[PDB]
Structures are given as structure tokens and as C-alpha cells.
Design a protein around this ligand. Structure first.
Ligand SMILES: O=C(O)CCc1ccccc1
Ligand SMILES: [Cl-]
Ligand SMILES: [Cl-]
Lengths: 203, 207
């Protein structure tokens, strides 16, 4: 219809084409709706849904509260490896996650950064080891730039390939099939026509 | 032994600054040539990084000059860099190789909170200010990366450093500004009189 709609997403989720593609499709079909967009991590985006300062969110499932919200599983992209071009393993078409047992891992801060981190370590432990914590920077951008500086490595969703930083390469892992999970989140009982049309343009 | 071969150096940099090739390049060079120093890297906006320099929780920073209180620190001006226009592929102005800023006087602009960004925000307003308008503030997001993803959603336009060409997001292109010459300055800030050897060797690898 027409009105306001507060849409949230994680910075890493925004690269996933389904996030700007849904905002594009909704902006075109309902150009009178006042869109108000927000960026934030999974837990903070959930607190806004609870309090009411947000209507729908592109977040990662598994957070503590997925029962009291309506969760629409969206897509599953694979997790690739960020490698410095100077690294000798960059020549490999596919990397065994086992090969990076002796490298530092630049990941999200262990605290509010609860998304993806837990997915890296779970896929990483399956290769039979636990990554030593390298540098902890709260943004994917700086994670990828810090790999360019030869400060370590990391695992990122395949949608991170759009960050074409000179000096880094993106290679999938052949040992396993790690994936990044995304979900559409909104409260269980919402009657907003402006919101309703959004889940319909997403799905 | 205490000649900078070993020890701890804390380096700071802003989000946008990291994309510039000087920041990563300097770090690897220092790392390569001084493996045994514990590098403690961290991100922050220029205001936060400078305060960390003054308070002693940070040894050197890659920040943007001009911030208030910068005369208290030693600033080595790094290489300047032009500011390009970001816009969706579907934008009709994307067909041009160079864009005039007066073209987008009513176009919604996708900027960032002035608190998270002082200089780049100032450069944007000052550029459009010379173009003869104040930018229609559309949405505000915290990381720059996110304005490029939001510009992919046709939610407006924005102006970012030329380093962000590396953000090759499907649906956005970058075209330089033709009617003016916006720029994005970068400096290396440290304490005037910090004689930490590890710090001094680091300045050598930057300049
Ligand atoms: O580099 C940035 O991320 C924005 C530039 C900036 C940020 C904060 C203060 C001055 C300049
Ligand atoms: Cl000096
Ligand atoms: Cl001086």
C-alpha cells in the first residue's frame, strides 16, 4: 500500500544479491512507501524487531529468539577463503581447509559479532583444528583488507567476491561444503500491508 | 634487541582508509621486514583514532587530516586520492564517462552519520556545495561498503574515494566528477615526540 517500512540487514548480508534486489523490487512496485534502511548485526537487528524500531530484517538464523519470530529461510551461499595473493596456496584451484591450520584467522569480534564467526569455527573444527585468533576487526571490509596486508586468512560468504581488493583472492574449500545461512525475520503477528508486500517481493 | 626488532606496535586505520593501497602495503612491508613485533591492528574513525593516540592506547593511525585538535599530533600527509561518484547501473547518468555534480541536486544521497565520518562527509557537502546545492540526504548507514550496496538498490547516489572501485558490487558503477576536483586526503598520525623504535621504523616503511 503506502506508508513506512523499516528494513534491516547485516553488512555482510547486504552483498548477497537478494538483499538489494528485494529493496529494488519493492522500491519499484511501491514507490510511495517511505523506506527506512538500517545496518547492524544479527543480535542487534533482533532487538529492534522486539522493541518495534524495525519491521523486517535480513539476518542469520540460529540466534537466541528464532522461535518468537517468523523466520523465512532465504538462501545458502557457500563460504570461500580469503587469501593473500602472495600466499603460495593461492595457486590452488580449491583449498583444503586443512592446509590453513598454521595460519592466523582474521574474524569478527567474538562479542557482538556472533554471526558467521560461529559458522567459521564449526566448519573449521571439521577440518580437525581450531583457528588461532589473529586480528579482530568488526567489519568484513577491513577483514578482507587485512588479508591483503598478509595478516592472516578468513572464511567469508561467496557473495564477498564483489570486494575485489587488490592482493586478495577468493577460493572455495574442497575439503567440505561450508555454507552461509540467511533468513528473513519478522514478528509472528503483523498486519502491516506495507510489510506484507515486502515478504512477497522477497520470496 | 630493542631496536625495533621485537615489541608491540598498535596501528589504527579507518574503514575507508583501509581500501587505499598504502595502508595494506605499508603493513605487509613492515611485517615482512620485522616479523617479530606483535602488530595490534584496529579500526576507528579519525576522531576516535586521534583520541586513542592522545590517551596512549594507540601508537600510529591512518586517518584523514583536518580534524579539530590535529595540531597536537605529528601528521605526515600521505598521497591524495580523487573522490568518484557511485551510482546504480540503471541510472541514466551512468552512460556518461564523467558526471557533473549539479546533475544530482534533487537526487537522494546515501551518506553516513557525520560522527562516523567527518572529512569524507565534509568533502561531499563541500563538493555539492560548490555545485550549488545541499545534497538531499536519503539514508544514512555506518560502513561505506553499505552505501555501495544500498546504491545497488537504487536508493540514491553517493560519493566515495577512488579506493572503493575495488567494491565491485553487481549493479553499481563509478564515474569521476568533471565539473570540480574532489579529493580524499590521508595522513599518518602519531604522537609528536614518541621515540618508540618500532613506531619510527614503521614511519620509514610508510613514507
Ligand atoms: O575514513 C572514513 O571512514 C571516513 C573519513 C573520516 C571519518 C571520521 C573522521 C574524519 C574522516
Ligand atoms: Cl617526525
Ligand atoms: Cl609541524
Amino acid at each position: 500500500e503506502s506508508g513506512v517500512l523499516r528494513v534491516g540487514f547485516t553488512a555482510s548480508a547486504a552483498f548477497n544479491s537478494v538483499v538489494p534486489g528485494a529493496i529494488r523490487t519493492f522500491k519499484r512496485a511501491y514507490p510511495d512507501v517511505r523506506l527506512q534502511l538500517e545496518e547492524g548485526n544479527t543480535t542487534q537487528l533482533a532487538d529492534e524487531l522486539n522493541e518495534g524500531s524495525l519491521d523486517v530484517a535480513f539476518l542469520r538464523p540460529g540466534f537466541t529468539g528464532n522461535e518468537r519470530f517468523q523466520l523465512r529461510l532465504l538462501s545458502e551461499e557457500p563460504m570461500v577463503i580469503v587469501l593473500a595473493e602472495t600466499h603460495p596456496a593461492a595457486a590452488c584451484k580449491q583449498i583444503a581447509l586443512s592446509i590453513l591450520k598454521d595460519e592466523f584467522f582474521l574474524l569478527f569480534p567474538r562479542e557482538i559479532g556472533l554471526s558467521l564467526y560461529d559458522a567459521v569455527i564449526k566448519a573449521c573444527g571439521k577440518a580437525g583444528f581450531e583457528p588461532k585468533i589473529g586480528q579482530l576487526v568488526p567489519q568484513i571490509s577491513s577483514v578482507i583488507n587485512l588479508v591483503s596486508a598478509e595478516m592472516g586468512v578468513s572464511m567469508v560468504p561467496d557473495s564477498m567476491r564483489q570486494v575485489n581488493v587488490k592482493g586478495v583472492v577468493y577460493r572455495p574449500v574442497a575439503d567440505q561444503m561450508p555454507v552461509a545461512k540467511l533468513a528473513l525475520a519478522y514478528r509472528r503477528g503483523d498486519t502491516s500491508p506495507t510489510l506484507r508486500n515486502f515478504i512477497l517481493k522477497v520470496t
